[PDB]
Design a protein around this nucleic acid. Structure first.
Ligand code: ZN
Ligand code: ZN
Lengths: 263, 267
DNA sequence: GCGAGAAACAAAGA
DNA sequence: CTCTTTGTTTCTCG
């Protein structure tokens, strides 16, 4: 999941679990709680979920007043709400039990993480990750973006995916955005023109905000209907009729139009 | 690679290339020759490799009389000897060709460097970097070492890594030394006792010489090492300390992965 | 001071 | 990027 998907998860959870008291926390894979499962159990049991925030692809549960739970799903993490008598599934790892149901975290890869952070350490935690700005016209400043790009010979796709220029792009939306901006994924950042950078800036926001609006991509989101390159190897570019190509860039599957996006 | 690995490489090359005349030097990544690839090609082509020395982690090729080739392998740099018709490999950057084969330099991450330096600028090259002493009893004076430590607030692990106190420790051997001397990586230099310092000094020499003897550490020319079997903490996270039984922990210290026994090494 | 970060880069690991 | 980490050194930041 990318930013839009995480934000969709944040909204669904906000509607459903805010106000709920945690009766118990149990784990079949405590190691995914990097800060220590027993500590987390001690501090959050009996507390009320007050809210759920997001920064980048990170979810932030406001539980009690002193601590926050920072959850990253990584590649395959998924939350579901189940009844109390719900049977286990193979890749369930963690559960928060409430008086009339439970919030289960599952992850086939076991990459996702929980981190218990004191409230005062949340801003620092994100500063320290060097996470870039939210992809909004409010936060994502084109001048700073331009300045950083002009200073780098990094290929634009991998650089965008670092999360430092702007937060929230994954493999799917980076390909979408480069297509929309007519930029080759292996173009060196400092070869981008000013106008090209402007369009890239806006396409980042426009695609990610649109995808939030459609509840993310499901491959129950609807953004998958609006994908122009991801998964369309061989099909015709809607803009020029060229066959969409798939190459590997810094180890990642990459879809692009060979006419609309040229190095 | 660290000092022991560079020494192992220096030995293997010394045995195999001294006396060879350079027929050609070619590069697919000329930018790693920081002083200018073309000048290097022009100055070394046709000359005989007379010897290879080492200072710290640096290799020093004596080729001809007027110039020295100073090579640093940084993180992953690797030399090998191949036949003349050898296929290229993905991360090969430079080759030095001889009449019966070639010496190829490869480096996945492209951190490694070559520099052409005139012979009478070699000693100043090293002085200018402030490289510390070689880790031998003869060169590594405990008295200077002590004075430098007593005067500094630096955390001991990053200070050792700087190469100025003593030359040749990298992330592996610094972790190993500190565990042997029972010193916490984050301990400030000036809080070290004279007896700690003495033990530290000796452990540096003892580990780096045992490492050279064992042909270096082969984790993932030079690649037949045995020292990796003698490691006590580096990469042993979650395993038992061999001295006290406690769980080896890993933390980050000045940006580097750091393995210690928290029982044996208290800050 | 100092330590922290970042640059240079690619691929493996969790 | 899903993100972090890696056998180094040199450099700028705060
Ligand atoms: Zn097209
Ligand atoms: Zn111990």
């Amino acid at each position: 999941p990318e930013l839009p998907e995480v934000e969709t998860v944040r909204r669904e959870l906000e509607k459903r679990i805010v106000g709920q008291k945690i009766i118990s926390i149990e784990a079949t894979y405590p190691r995914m709680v990097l800060t220590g499962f027993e500590q987390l159990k001690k501090e959050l049991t009996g507390k009320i979920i007050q809210g759920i925030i997001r920064r980048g692809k990170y979810l932030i549960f406001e539980i009690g007043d002193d601590f926050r739970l920072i959850s990253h799903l990584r590649m395959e993490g998924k939350y579901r709400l189940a009844t109390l008598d719900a049977p286990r599934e193979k890749h369930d790892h963690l559960t928060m039990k409430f008086s009339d149901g439970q919030l289960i975290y599952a992850d086939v890869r076991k990459f996702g993480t929980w981190e218990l952070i004191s409230t005062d350490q949340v801003l620092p935690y994100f500063l320290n990750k060097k996470i870039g700005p939210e992809p909004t016209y409010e936060d994502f400043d084109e001048k700073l973006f331009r300045e950083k790009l002009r200073k780098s010979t990094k290929k634009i796709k991998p650089y965008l995916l670092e999360q430092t220029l702007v937060a929230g792009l994954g493999n799917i939306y980076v390909d979408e955005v480069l297509w929309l901006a007519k930029i080759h994924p292996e173009k060196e950042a400092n070869q981008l023109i000013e106008s090209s950078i402007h369009l890239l800036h806006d396409s980042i926001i426009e695609i990610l905000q649109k995808a939030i609006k459609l509840g993310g991509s499901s491959i129950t989101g609807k953004m998958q209907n609006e994908l122009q390159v991801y998964g369309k190897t061989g099909e015709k570019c809607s803009r020029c009729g060229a066959e969409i190509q798939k190459i590997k860039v810094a180890g990642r599957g990459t879809h692009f139009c060979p006419f609309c996006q040229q190095k």
